[PDB]
Amino acid sequence: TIPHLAIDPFSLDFFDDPYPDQQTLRDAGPVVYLDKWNVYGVARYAEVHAVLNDPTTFCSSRGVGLSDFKKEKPWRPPSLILEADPPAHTRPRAVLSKVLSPATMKTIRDGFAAAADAKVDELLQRGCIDAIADLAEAYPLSVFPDAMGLKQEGREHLLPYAGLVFNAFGPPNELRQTAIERSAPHQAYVNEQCQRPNLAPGGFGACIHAFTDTGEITPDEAPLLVRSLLSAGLDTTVNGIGAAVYCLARFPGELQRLRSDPTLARNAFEEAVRFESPVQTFFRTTTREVELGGAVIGEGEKVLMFLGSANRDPRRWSDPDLYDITRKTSGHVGFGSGVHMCVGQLVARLEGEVMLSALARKVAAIDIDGPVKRRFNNTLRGLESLPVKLTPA
Numbered sequence: 001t002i003p004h005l006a007i008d009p010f011s012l013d014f015f016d017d018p019y020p021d022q023q024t025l026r027d028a029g030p031v032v033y034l035d036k037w038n039v040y041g042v043a044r045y046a047e048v049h050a051v052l053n054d055p056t057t058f059c060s061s062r063g064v065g066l067s068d069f070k071k072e073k074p075w076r077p078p079s080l081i082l083e084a085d086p087p088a089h090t091r092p093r094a095v096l097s098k099v100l101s102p103a104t105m106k107t108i109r110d111g112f113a114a115a116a117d118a119k120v121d122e123l124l125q126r127g128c129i130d131a132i133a134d135l136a137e138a139y140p141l142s143v144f145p146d147a148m149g150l151k152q153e154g155r156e157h158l159l160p161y162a163g164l165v166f167n168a169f170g171p172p173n174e175l176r177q178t179a180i181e182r183s184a185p186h187q188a189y190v191n192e193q194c195q196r197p198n199l200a201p202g203g204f205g206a207c208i209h210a211f212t213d214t215g216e217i218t219p220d221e222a223p224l225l226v227r228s229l230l231s232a233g234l235d236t237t238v239n240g241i242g243a244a245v246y247c248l249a250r251f252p253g254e255l256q257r258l259r260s261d262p263t264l265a266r267n268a269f270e271e272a273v274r275f276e277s278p279v280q281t282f283f284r285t286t287t288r289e290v291e292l293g294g295a296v297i298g299e300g301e302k303v304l305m306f307l308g309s310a311n312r313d314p315r316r317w318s319d320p321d322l323y324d325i326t327r328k329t330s331g332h333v334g335f336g337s338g339v340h341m342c343v344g345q346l347v348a349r350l351e352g353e354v355m356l357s358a359l360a361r362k363v364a365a366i367d368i369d370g371p372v373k374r375r376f377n378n379t380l381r382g383l384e385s386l387p388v389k390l391t392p393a
């Protein structure tokens with residue numbers, strides 16, 4: 001009843017151009033079986049949304065990677081928020097929701113916006129830049145470690161550790177085993193900065209520790225929640241901002257619409273998250289036998305969700321392969337959906353908005369003027385290098 005496909009969604013050829021294989025996965029049926037890895041797959045919007053909003057059947061406490069925590073040891077202690085289910089998930093989620101709250105955004109907005117303005121003006125003085133290293137990486141590195149309250153020493157471990165984290169959600173292919181092998185120095189740096197004495201008061205990390213007073217998390221839970229922000233809050237925004245610049249460089253008509261109304265900056269970033277989906281895939285594990293799309297999935301089966309594919313499903317989106325900065329983007333699953341929907345989404349949108357705002361006001365054109373290089377990751381989609389010319393407005 002369920003089609004069996006040999007597509008490997010964690011192969012380099014898939015990463016290089018996933019869109020044809022993603023249509024094949026969508027059009028094969030609402031639920032497929034991937035013989036390469038012995039997992040179920042869902043690539044249409046309807047089933048991806050359905051699975052995300054059914055947490056009691058499609059759980060996260062057995063891992064959101066390919067590995068089943070009931071069968072193998074997690075490569076690091078399980079995340080208290082990402083790799084937990086209600087009710088254990090709820091109070092740690094509430095802490096991160098308050099730490100990264102709308103109220104908190106007010107305290108960082110001016111510095112985040114000023115840093116974005118300064119970066120774009122700095123890059124315009126150079127003319128020909130790398131939009132990844134000099135922008136998509138440089139800007140988040142200039143604001144997010146500070147906002148976490150991290151010390152200066154050791155920040156060079158942050159992007160390598162995040163790449164390891166997201167490669168580890170994948171199957172035990174070379175990308176994953178290369179990342180986990182000899183990863184101890186990255187783990188040691190991160191785990192050390194998660195301890196309260198190393199976090200600047202007033203920053204995100206110290207505020208998590210401050211919530212141990214409330215009864216919402218214990219002192220021994222706070223370092224692991226600091227770890228969550230250091231795992232999920234940097235590389236994702238790097239790929240998201242790079243995707244937005246990539247979209248504006250490819251769709252000059254949309255850059256010009258953004259220039260003419262910089263208040264479209266926030267939705268221009270949101271559409272970039274839908275269009276490129278920095279987080280492409282992750283898993284759930286069935287807690288019971290379950291019917292999904294006419295398909296009977298047994299207990300303890302891994303289900304792979306294609307977020308990027310769901311964000312391009314023509315069953316849901318008109319002209320899904322067009323970047324449209326006035327598209328009604330509400331409902332895309334680039335940040336997930338349901339109880340686990342990205343708790344740092346306000347931080348991501350703040351960075352993206354103020355960067356695209358700076359571009360909208362200061363830049364007249366963005367022209368690719370060098371070889372474009374893709375960055376390969378089992379779960380993250382993004383570029384390694386994006387040489388562009390910036391023309392000042």
Ligand code: HEM
Nearest residue numbers: 081082228232233236237240335336340342343344347348
């Ligand atoms: C463009 C940027 C980002 C994207 C595309 C993104 C994507 C996602 C997605 C798809 C999920 C859901 C995972 C699941 O359902 O299993 C998620 C969860 C999460 N994200 Fe983000 N994220 C971004 C930025 C951030 C930032 C800036 C932070 C922290 C400052 C962050 C921290 C987290 C955490 C802690 C979770 C776990 C939430 C939970 O399980 O309840 N992310 N993210």
Ligand SMILES: CCC(=O)c1ccc(C(=O)O)cc1
Nearest residue numbers: 079082227228231232279282
């Ligand atoms: C889709 C994966 C993701 O974005 C993420 C990764 C790690 C953590 C964590 O360490 O809790 C949370 C979310």
Ligand SMILES: [Cl-]
Nearest residue numbers: 076187190191
């Ligand atoms: Cl770690």
Ligand SMILES: [Mg+2]
Nearest residue numbers: 151197198199
């Ligand atoms: Mg010390």
